[PDB]
Design a protein around this ligand. Structure first.
Ligand SMILES: Nc1ncnc2c1ncn2[C@@H]1O[C@H](COP(=O)(O)OP(=O)(O)O)[C@@H](O)[C@H]1O
Ligand SMILES: [Mg+2]
Lengths: 49, 52
């Protein structure tokens, strides 16, 4: 197995089987208005809180 | 397409340009808050009216 960092989003976390990889870069692609900035924001907020 | 800072409608809303100008009657604004009345209306047919 590999390390994983939960992102607060329960559905996404259980879809990824733990969350985004820990210590590795993750890419969030999508046109304007898809929600990449909010994705990153909740990532950080949930990680801290 | 993108409104930063708060929620908003995301569907495509058909609008019209008329004498007033822009008019938008979104189908998402309808709500089920209808005051009911206890009065009755007359259809004009006595038999049909008495049937109920
Ligand atoms: N309070 C809110 N409630 C629901 N949706 C919101 C709210 N605030 C922002 N959004 C959504 O976030 C979107 C923009 O997110 P953002 O990631 O900052 O832009 P982009 O997706 O271009 O990176 C808006 O299009 C809007 O639908
Ligand atoms: Mg953005």
């Amino acid at each position: 197995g590999i390390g994983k960092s939960p992102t607060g989003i329960q559905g996404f976390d259980e879809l990824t089987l733990g969350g985004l990889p820990t210590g590795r870069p993750s890419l969030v692609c999508g046109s304007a208005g898809c929600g990449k900035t909010l994705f990153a924001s909740t990532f950080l907020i949930n990680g801290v809180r | 397409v993108k409104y930063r800072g708060t929620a908003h409608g995301t569907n495509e809303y058909p609008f019209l340009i008329d004498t007033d100008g822009f008019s938008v009657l979104p189908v998402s604004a309808l709500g089920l808050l209808h005051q009911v009345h206890e009065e009755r209306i007359a259809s004009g047919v006595p038999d049909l009216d008495a049937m109920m």
